[PDB]
Design a protein around this nucleic acid. Sequence first.
RNA 1: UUGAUGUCACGGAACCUUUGUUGUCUUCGACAUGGGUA
RNA 2: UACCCAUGUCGAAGACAACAAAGUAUUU
Length: 735
Amino acid sequence: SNPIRDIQDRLKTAKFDNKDDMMNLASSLYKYEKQLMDSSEATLCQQGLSNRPNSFSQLSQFRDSDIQSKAGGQTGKFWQNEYEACKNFQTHKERRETLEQIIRFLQDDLLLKTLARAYFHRGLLYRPKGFSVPARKVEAMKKAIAYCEIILDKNEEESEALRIWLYAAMELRRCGEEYPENFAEKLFYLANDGFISELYDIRLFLEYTEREEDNNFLDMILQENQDRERLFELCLYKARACFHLNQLNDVRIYGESAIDNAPGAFADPFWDELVEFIRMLRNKKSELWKEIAIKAWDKCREKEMKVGNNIYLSWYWARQRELYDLAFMAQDGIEKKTRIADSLKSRTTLRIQELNELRKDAHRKQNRRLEDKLDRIIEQENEARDGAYLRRNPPCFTGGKREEIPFARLPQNWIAVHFYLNELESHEGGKGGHALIYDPQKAEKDQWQDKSFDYKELHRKFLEWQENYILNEEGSADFLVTLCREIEKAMPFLFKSEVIPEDRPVLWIPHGFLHRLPLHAAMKIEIFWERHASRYLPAWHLFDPAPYSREESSTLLKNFEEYDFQNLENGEIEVYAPSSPKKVKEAIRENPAILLLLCHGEADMTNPFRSCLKLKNKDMTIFDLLTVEDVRLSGSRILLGACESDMVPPLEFSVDEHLSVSGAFLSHKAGEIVAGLWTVDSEKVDECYSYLVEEKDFLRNLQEWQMAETENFRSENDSSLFYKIAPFRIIGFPA
RNA sequence: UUGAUGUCACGGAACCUUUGUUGUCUUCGACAUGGGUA
RNA sequence: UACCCAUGUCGAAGACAACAAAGUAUUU
C-alpha cells in the first residue's frame, strides 16, 4: 500500500479552505495509523517525509483542533454514503469491515447523525437463527437510539435524527423488545414532516396510519416509483395501503404480485413481513386472509425444496412454521390439510437419506473427494447441533427425485392416521390438535375424516413422565400408565368403529411430541393393541414399499454378557459375541435378511448424533452409522434389543424430526425396524424377538405377543408389567 | 423496605490472544578568561 | 579610533530515543 507516500501526495495538493483536500488528508493519515496498529507488512516502511519544514508546517496546520474535527465528520459522511451505494455488491465480511471502520473512525450533529446511522446499519447485518435473536442486534439498535437522543434533546424537529430513532425503535420491536418510551409523540412529529425519504419510511407511515387511523399519507405510498430492486417488498406495502383504503381487489393484486416474486432466501426480512401481513388480515377478519395464506404456503413449500443443507434449513426455514399453521387453518379440504401438514415433517431426515444415497454412488465409482465433501457436511451438522460457530460455509446439495406420494398408494386394507399440532390455534385457546384419518375403501367423498382434540394436558403428562423417567427410572411406571390413559382421554375417537373400522391395521404418522408416545398402547381396561395392529412412519413422503432382502443369510450380534438369551441363542440364526463396532460395520454391508443386535443403548440428553449403542470396546453413535463408507441394507429387517434405541433427547428441536437409532437405520432404507421407546427387559426381548424371528411377519406377531402378555396384566393391573410390554414398536412400511 | 397458593440464579470461570523488547566500542587534547596602550 | 595580545590550566558524559495498552468472526 505504502501509506507514507499517500501522505506526501496529499500534502502537496492540500489547501485548508477546500473540503476535498482535508477529506483526503484525514483519510490518508487515518489509514497510516490503522496500518501501524495492525502490525501490517506496511510497517516495514522505514522512509520519512521530504521537505521537512514545509511538511511540518502543513501537518501542524492540519492538526488544528477545528480543522481536523471538521474533516472528521465529512470523511465519515462520505464513507457512509459510499457504503450505502455499494452495500449490495459487497459480501458480509467486507460490509462489516466497512461499517466498523466508520464507527472506529468517528469514535457536532453531523458526526453524531453519521455514527447513529452507521450503528443502525451494523445492526441490520445480524439475522435471527432459529427462534433466537442475537444480542448484538439489540445492542446496536440501542446505541443508535442513544446517539440520536443527543440531537433530539436540543432539536426535536431534526428529521434525520428522528427518522433514525424511529427505525431503531421499530427494529427493537421486531427483536421482541418493547418500544422505547415516547415512541407515540416522536412518531407524531414524523407525520408532521410528511415526506418519504427512503424505503423504510413507508413502514413508518403505515405505523402512523394504524395508530392515528389517518389515511392522508397512503396516496404517497401508492404513487411510489416501481424502479426498485426489492420490488416484492414495495408491493407488500402497496397491499397494506390498499387495505386501509378498502381497495380490496388491489389488495388481492398486490399481494399476489408480492408472493409471486418472493426471494429464495428465508433469511430475507420479506418472510417476516408477509406473516405479519397475513396476521393483520386475519385479525381484521378480512376474507382475503385465506387466499393469501394458501398462496404464501405454496410459495414457501416451493422454495423449501431449494434449501441446500440441514444447517440453513434449521436456521432460517424453521422460522416459517407459523405460515403453515395459518395455511392449515385457511384450508377446508381435509386432503389438502393433510398435504399442508405433511410438508412440514422430517425435512432433515430426507436430506440425510439423500446423502446416504449419494455415498453409495461415490463408493461404487471411487470418487474419494466427493466422499470427503459428504463427510464434511455431516461433521458440520454435528457441530451446529452443539451450537458451535462454523468457520466455513457448509456446502449445498441438490435434492433427489422428490415425487409427491399419492395417498391412494396405501394398500386397500389399511387405515392411516395423520397428526398435526397447530400451535397458533392451541395458543389462542382452541383445540389445536388434529387427527386426519384416511379410509381408502370408501367412496371418494367419504374417504377422509378430521377429528380434533386439546393436547395441552397430554403434553403436560408426557413431560411429567419424561422427567420422572430420567430421575428414577423404573419407578416411573405409574406415570406411564397415567400417560397412556391420558391418550384415550384426549383422543376418545380412537376406540370408535365408525372412525377406525373393525380390526383393520393402522398406520401412524405422528407430529411433534406424538412421535415420543406409545400410541399403540392407549388405554381405555382395554388396550388399543387388542383391536388393531400398528405401524409407524415419520412422514408420508417417506412412504416407499420395497421387497424384503433376498439374501439367504442372517446374523445375531451380541455384546451383553450379564444375561443368557436362551431362546435367541437356540434359534437357527448363528450368534457372534462379543461384537465390536467393526463387526457391526461388516454385517451392515452384507444386506442380511434379519439382523439382531443385543447390547445396551443410551439416548443422549442434548444432541441426537451422540445417541449410541454400547458395543464391546467402543460406543457406536448415530454419527458413526451416518458416516460408514459402505452400507447395504435395502430391504433388511432389523431388530434392536438395545434400551432407548427409539428414544430422542428430552428437547424440542427447531424442526419436526425423530432422529433415533431406529431412525438412523431407516435413513439407510431398512425394510422395517423393531426397537424400544424406553428401557427394555432382557427376558422380554428374548421371548418377543425369538417369536418374531420364528414367525417372520412382524405386524401380526408383535400384536399376538402383546395380546398374550396383556392377560397377565389384567389379573392384577400391575404398572410394572405394562411398563415391560409397551416399549416395542415397528417403524417402516415394506412391500 | 416484601406481599403471599408458584423465584432451579450454588442457572453463568472475567474468560480468551500478546517475548520488557529494539538501537548504543567504558571511551578520550587543545582549550579557558577579558582587556591593555596611545 | 587605531595598535597589541597576555596567562597556564583542566576532566567530560552517568542514560537517551520508541512503544505506556490493544484486540476479541454469527454466516449462502
